[PDB]
Design a protein around this ligand. Sequence first.
Ligand SMILES: Cc1cc(C)c(N)cn1
Length: 155
Amino acid sequence: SDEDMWDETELGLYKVNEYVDARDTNMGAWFEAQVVRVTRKAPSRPALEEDVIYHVKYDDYPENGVVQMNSRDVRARARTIIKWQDLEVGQVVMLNYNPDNPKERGFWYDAEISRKRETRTARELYANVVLGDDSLNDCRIIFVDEVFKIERPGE
Ligand SMILES: Cc1cc(C)c(N)cn1
């Protein structure tokens, strides 16, 4: 076996210099980052995206250094907002939530829209917010005009 051996690659799904979102595995949120190097472990195998290690710098956390990511924790940078009128229960989107202080600005989490209400006085959005392998149901989402479409690589 050769999990310890790696080489650079230019044939990862994401490329050096690409602006991406990268997911912190300790707290489950996505952050703006840039890919600075792409390596691939196990040179004995045919090239697999599962073997790619992305080396990223988080835009707002330079003190974290060059962080290594599994391919599942990198995706193209979110760029398109799904406006209020287009949001629907069941959509999985990236949105801003603060689990510790839910009235405040927080971090960017993936979330499944769970309830959408329009009353005479407010637009109310609720979502099941993903943290790692688990989710918090029915979080009230403050930032209803900044919900992002997730860029999926496809298959
Ligand atoms: C984590 C993240 C946040 C924003 C606002 C955008 N546009 C992309 N990624």
